[PDB]
Symmetry: D3
Subunit: 307 residues, 6 copies
């Protein structure tokens, strides 16, 4: 009754979810021209079934987005009972506001695209802004990496009871403040000026940079230096979405990080090769658990505060 399909080419995160559910991934033959025009042929019947399409990648976002959208459509047109998009890292999520300029809210566009494509339900992790849920009329489940992050912290940082959770930007205050209270520790905010400033005591404490996403890593690297200047004994960085475009890993090796921790929301195998500082938290259990519970009609909320 339940079927899991993998988009992209990285069937890694997909397979783990499949394994944890006692299932194999559905057959998909995918052809691509030099145009990167994507052809999909669902290798098996999904009529009357509860279909889950997992999208992992974020290396070529437009190819990946279109591949997902095409698959959703193929399944919806083949009489699937329900089509759920499992998008651990939500594409164009940083484009959720106009910011005083004639910009698109591309995250709303993407949400409209997923909707008009045939998605009935969305399972995602750590929306860049929670308000992105409101870009849908279908239900969205926004899972938190926090519980697993909270857990990683207590087990890997001896000093966690005396640390400071730091936000690298002004927008991330609520997240770090929500984590700092749970752990019962200090918080601190960094803000890049529109002409980097830190607010909060970080002195003689290990500082933990927490954000939902890292990309070029300019921000976290600069915040790392800034924190050490402020008297932090060491700096960690925990981010759920580790995009790591180009220079990011050269920068991670150059900056004084104890470790940069991410979830496998995005494939990290190749990056861990040329970067020893990177550690990965496996979030496939949470996803597998969201899927299993969506299909059974159980509470997926347990996953908001339990691993």
């Amino acid at each position: 009754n339940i079927k899991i399909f993998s988009g992209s080419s990285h069937q890694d995160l997909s397979q783990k979810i499949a394994d944890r559910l006692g299932l194999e991934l559905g057959k998909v033959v995918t052809k691509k021209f030099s145009n990167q025009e994507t052809c999909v042929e669902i290798g098996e019947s999904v009529r009357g079934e509860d279909v889950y399409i997992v999208q992992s990648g974020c290396g070529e976002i437009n190819d990946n987005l279109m591949e997902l959208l095409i698959m959703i459509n193929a399944c919806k047109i083949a009489s699937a009972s329900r089509v759920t998009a499992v998008i651990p890292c939500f594409p164009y999520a940083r484009q959720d506001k106009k910011d005083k300029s004639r910009a698109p809210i591309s995250a709303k566009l993407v949400a409209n695209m997923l909707s008009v494509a045939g998605a009935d339900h969305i399972i995602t992790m750590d929306l860049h802004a929670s308000q992105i849920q409101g870009f849908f009329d279908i239900p969205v489940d926004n899972l938190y990496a926090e519980p697993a992050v909270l857990k990683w912290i207590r087990e890997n940082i001896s000093e966690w009871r005396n640390c400071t959770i730091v936000s690298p930007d002004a927008g991330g205050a609520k997240r770090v403040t929500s984590i700092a209270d749970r752990l019962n520790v200090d918080f601190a905010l960094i803000h890049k000026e529109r002409k980097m400033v830190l607010v909060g005591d970080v002195k003689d404490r290990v500082a933990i940079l927490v954000d939902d996403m890292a990309d070029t890593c300019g921000t976290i690297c600069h915040a790392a230096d800034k924190l050490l200047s402020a008297g932090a004994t060491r700096v960690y960085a925990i981010l759920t979405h580790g995009i790591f475009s180009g220079p990011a890993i050269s920068r991670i090796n150059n900056a004084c990080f104890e470790a940069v921790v991410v979830t496998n929301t995005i494939p990290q195998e190749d990056k861990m090769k040329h970067c020893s500082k990177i550690q990965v938290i496996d979030i496939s259990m949470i996803l597998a658990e969201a899927i299993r519970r969506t299909h059974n009609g159980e509470s997926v909320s347990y996953l908001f505060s339990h691993v």
Copy 2:
């Protein structure tokens, strides 16, 4: 060609907007049962015209929302060319995210309700979150009180060049940093720890509390006391939306606020009587200008910076 109608009973802000445009308000007969069931009858032909309904109030939020929605329907059903909702303060704007519980996203409900009522375009001021624009498929113009707020600070606060802009909660971080930078001054945050802390220096300087909206005033009140304990010379409070429910007036009079600044986004004549500390920035010119420029096809974006 242009037509301006007032929802509510508070002709207050609408009349000024009609004035700045050399217009009178359209004839409306609105009848209300003891039930509060709202009857509306448009007293002239809107056929083919550019309709602007101004909803000012926030005293009975469900009443005023229904009144506005019904007026939109009536106009759209009477062959209006365009129907534009002028909502200086967007109702249910705080409810823009689930926030880790089985809660509704009520600001998305409102957006959908306005849309299905026949809204073509929206004009509003300081959306509690920028991403609410994304809750629509119709164009949204979100104006800023910021210029008028910067203007006020510089001209009414002698010590402003060395003040600290303070966010009463961790949510308004982006807001105070943007003001703090434009004014090239310091920021600081306050946070109620889930069992009240201050990050950033405020000592021997004036602190300005900046928030988008206030209601009961409890938060800005306990924030002002924390600020006073931290050695701020004096505390100001600037809000673009001044709801001021129940205890707010006394609490504003009793607490240490130098002054309390609001806009006439929400009627403030009654509150002025019982409270001397309050200053009101008239925003009718900005709104009037957004209307003139929506109708003409001109750049309302100039209003993001020019008073």
Copy 3:
């Protein structure tokens, strides 16, 4: 698999339906500001479930309507399998036509609001006009109080075999005529003139005023006098929706009514206090029965001609 939630504060009619189904009402925490801005947090998981939200009240129609709309939304966004609005008295139902004026068809607006909010199905009683069903694209079940009214008549009025069913207005002719034929008795119509006239023999017969709704009661009280002037031995009034705004009960005690009968579609406990003439028919069995049968996939039509 089935869950019942109560909106409003009057959990009375809700509980009875819950009892008749061997169920308890779902947990809902509701917060309201002085603004009457409504916050809802569904206290339990509704994922995959068949959710029924009962709305009773009609005292503050806009608060009640918004509370319902918010709850529907909360449930739809929490992955409910189906959300059914159980609205015994349909709000703004009297606003179902333009009536030669620039009015809204607010009943259509309300229907659009319920739709865009996430309702999948509607269960209601005695639509002011049957055509309101057509304001939806979702299915609507319009239950009739008639069977229970027919029953109340045969059991409480000794003379029922020789009575006259009277319509207080020209619009209610079809209803009273449908009831008069069943019982095998006379009908009679009243009409207020646009400068009160009765058509039909009422002489030496007990007259029964039948309408779907009573409010201020001006109409039924004036019709009561008119009927007695016409030679009616006594006058009853049976109405399914007993709003009873302000003066209505002072008027009921003043006019020569034998009894005014309503259904508990609207809470009558407080009104029966200062009014002895008021009697209530319990319609919770019909509603409980509509719900039980919607969820099981049985015929709810039996309830159109059986109690």
Copy 4:
């Protein structure tokens, strides 16, 4: 800028409307197979224009409805600025409610069909029920033959000042009372009792049967006989829509009707031949005027009262 097209084969009413406006009808080539499959080709550019398709007929209601729908599609698909459906008689208008059975609401289907075909606005005369306006989300203008009907009565019925306006069924109560009041005269109702009664006095006066539409004429025929038995001097019959199927003509000739009044909402030249009693009120001026004023942005509401 304006463009008027005729659906059907009955150029009859369209040509007059085009005349009153100083316009010729747009070139249409419509081809029909023995199948009655309708082919339509627009014979000139409608790109950027205000299109008005006039559908007059009601001889083969499915044919004429499809023809009209296809013409709308064609124009909307050829970049017409606006497409307006002129349907003097709204098809399936009687089917506006389930009426206690598993029936469709076909007038809501029609509304939806017209809308999804690309209709922007509707002009119609005497909707069988006002609430049908609610079946749309597009603007509806519903014109009245009433003024033209009042006008006719006063000028053609000598006894009119003491006549009785009679509704042939209980449904048309509101209709006859509105006419009866405007003329300051008596009303009366007729009802076929579900196993024919008259309520109201008609004795020694002329009775005018008023209904919105007639078809087979059985109802107005048995009504006229009841009226004659009740001692009406003479019986008139006034309908805005004269469908007149099969037996209608003979039955109108045989029965006692002084005259039978209709509008040219539906073609009446053929029926005039075989039936001398029939009088036709031309409504082309009213329709022509609704079009002129929809296009200009003027008050069509003046047509609710001014001939």
Copy 5:
């Protein structure tokens, strides 16, 4: 859980499908005025059920289309779980493109009509163009008569291993080419010139005209002559949709056809009377099989390449 209703009056194809499924057809009372205005009353409850409405006919396409649309609506409004339109011959299917003229794409209109009427799923046979599937957002299953046609060929034409599949028009090339490869034989195309030309060797071979549809038969009759002139020993014609308007059967008897084969997608009983050349393939097994499998959630694709 599954219900089959027959539209039209031809309950023939409907009954066969019903028989093959161990089911009786649902009760439908249908009233029609001289107007051909269609009334439907579903004689039994369809609440929670999987409803299938079969439309056979194509004699009066607009009556048939409206009857279907009305039934879908009646069922959707009576709380059917799912409504599937089983339309063996898709109406207006030949109107799927603009063809360099201001025409409607009526097939898209029809698809929009079926959608807005309440259909959730479509089962059809041999779409005139496969692209018509894309006129929907609901799923469409386009069954092929080919497997049964392939079978009929091997069993009724001794020479099938040496025949030529001929397309009567340029648009039908893909179909005949797909059939010619399966059988492992030649193909040939005919094209009527815009001032009839054949491409391909037909000499000393039995030629088989294959198209999806035949109507007046002008085309196939003219192609038959043309093929015999080209040296074909005999000519067959296999078409899935045998409309056979007026002259078609007089023409079939006059032209040198060995046999004209159609499916009973359209009623052929009356036409086989005055035409001996006509043979019918029963496709009720394929349809019954599509229905049975849609409802069970099995693969209906087996029916694309198996009888």
Copy 6:
């Protein structure tokens, strides 16, 4: 009033269109991460204007499609009066049917994506299938290169009066027959038999290969060889869309083609360098003219025939 924007990096075709109209292109700042996440900021006010976004490219089809979609959103969200997509080559146009497998209809996805992005109208050239127009509810103008192609043949091919127009697959039958007739010459088809045949005579005459689009060129290449074996004097190849991936250039240089004709629907400057045989028909005048006439309200249909 008019505004022309260029999507992509290929200002190539847009600039010419802007030239032919006496316009400059609107200011756009588009920023792209290594991710290929597309950021777009409109550099001037489009409020109230007629927007035309030109998307030329087809080098990275997902990139260019996303870029175009985002630009549409941005403009529609900035109060543009109308947004029109100019897509000379419609992306995913080949995927217009399931074709007997569980495939998506990706050209319908694209249509839906463009629509939900805020597209009001579309201008395109030679849709791979006419029925794709049906995939929209918005107006589509589908222009032909045909006149420009006929023009080219007559003027560049000496032998044209006795040439044969050849379709490289069985799909393009309609295409080559339409050209063959207009030119009053012969047609012929080629077909790869599913285990390459030619139907129609080509011997001792020039064969022109006509197709709508080519990519790898394999099909037109094996077609040219078949044609050469059949005794065509020389082979030409005419395509309206010249994608030319990977091996296409060498294969065009090595194979026997006299010349290869394309339009500048897709950029062709790079391909010209490495390939001498290629001729390009500039279509900027046709597109420029469709824009001028969409904006003015003029007949773009004249472009179906007049160069």
